[PDB]
Write a sequence for this structure.
């Protein structure tokens, strides 16, 4: 059981009111079965694109989840990951500074 | 520079089904170029790089037939390992393989490569000699003995030094325009002030290809050890990569710090500092 | 071009 590492970040440098792509990059996990959700203000985003699953030289699996989004001063975005290695789902918020 | 080809294979057993899910991914110079997935409507190896579209129907048919063989190889190997470890098919189990070859800048073979993992842990590997095996545990010793008896290593050596090298030569020539292309990082520094009269300086590198990159920080001269924060290189999702490196600096020395970005795509390394709005 | 494995594990 390998614990997933998560990064939540935009494809392009963010600007409030400008359409962008929000990424949720999940790595270093095993087994390959995983559940990934993307959230806007705590609510599930319906259209989420998932890359095909791949694995790294250390055998661990990785996947990229993404969705269109328009950053604003008030809206919050997060990625919630459920995996066998974790007692509880892990939620990482998007932070424009990272 | 150096070159490589790899096939990354995965089989995941499915409780209640005889056939596992089988996925094979091919890479040339760490870039995906082919893919086979047993879960597809009509499973077939498919091109994943534009330069592979030039391969004729016989190539795709020959690779697809190999994948059908591999599905059976993985199904039987998973069943054997289930017995070795006294496990239940009521749970899913994972078998993985990496194989291929590495070449020098002149395209001559540097090394063959072959390894296996079970449940995400090293199981058995072919040594760099391409003649002897390293078993990770007692159960893998059963496989090692079986393979020594059947002379399995000789057949892998033939592929890794022969066909692997010849096909990679063809792919490097066919994929030349795509493989040689680079995307330079665009860099910028951001300011994130904190407690104790400190401010974090973040040097960003965006939209670069390949993923290999180096970011450094300095106060006038001399590089900064350990105190620098560095995220893992991440895909932007458009074929390019991103990375950042940050430093905690006193609130009076920001314009005194410089970041450097090293990437093969750049006409020369980047040099930058925080710029006031 | 991919390889076909020899004896099963």
């Amino acid at each position: 059981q390998k614990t997933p590492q998560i990064q939540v970040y935009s494809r392009h440098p963010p600007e409030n009111g400008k359409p962008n792509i929000l990424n949720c990059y999940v790595t270093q996990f095993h087994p390959p079965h995983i559940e990934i959700q993307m959230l806007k203000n705590g609510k599930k985003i319906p259209k989420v694109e998932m890359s095909d699953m791949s694995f790294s030289k250390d055998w661990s699996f990785y996947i990229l989840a993404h969705t269109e989004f328009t950053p604003t001063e008030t809206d919050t975005y997060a990625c919630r990951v459920k995996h066998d290695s974790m007692a509880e789902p892990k939620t990482v918020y998007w932070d424009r500074d990272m | 520079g150096p070159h490589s080809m790899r096939y990354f294979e995965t089989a995941v057993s499915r409780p209640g089904l005889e056939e596992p899910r089988y996925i094979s991914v091919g890479y040339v110079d760490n870039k995906e170029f082919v893919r086979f997935d047993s879960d597809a409507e009509n499973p077939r190896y498919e091109p994943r790089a534009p330069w592979m579209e030039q391969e004729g129907p016989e190539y795709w048919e020959r690779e697809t037939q190999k994948a059908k063989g591999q599905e059976q190889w993985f199904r039987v190997s998973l069943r054997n390992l289930l017995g070795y470890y006294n496990q239940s098919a009521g749970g899913s189990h994972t078998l993985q393989q990496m194989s291929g070859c590495d070449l020098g800048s002149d395209w001559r073979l540097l090394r063959g490569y072959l390894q296996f993992a079970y449940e995400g842990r090293d199981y058995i590997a072919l040594n760099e000699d391409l003649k002897t095996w390293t078993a990770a545990d007692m159960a893998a010793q059963i496989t090692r003995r079986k393979w020594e008896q059947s002379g399995a290593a000789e057949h892998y050596k033939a592929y890794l030094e022969g066909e692997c090298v010849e096909w990679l030569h063809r792919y490097l020539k066919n994929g030349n325009a795509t493989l040689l292309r680079t995307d330079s990082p665009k860099a910028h520094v951001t300011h994130h002030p904190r407690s104790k009269g400190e401010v974090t300086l973040r040097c960003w590198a965006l939209g670069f290809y390949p993923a290999d990159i180096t970011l450094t920080w300095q106060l006038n001269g001399e590089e900064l050890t350990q105190d620098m924060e560095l995220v893992e290189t991440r895909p932007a999702g458009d074929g390019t990569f991103q990375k950042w490196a940050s430093v905690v600096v006193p609130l009076g020395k920001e314009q005194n710090y410089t970041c450097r970005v090293y990437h093969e795509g750049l006409p020369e390394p980047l040099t930058l500092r925080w710029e006031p709005p | 071009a991919s390889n076909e494995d020899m004896e099963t594990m």
Observations:
- Residues 1 and 8 of chain C are 20 Å apart (CA to CA).
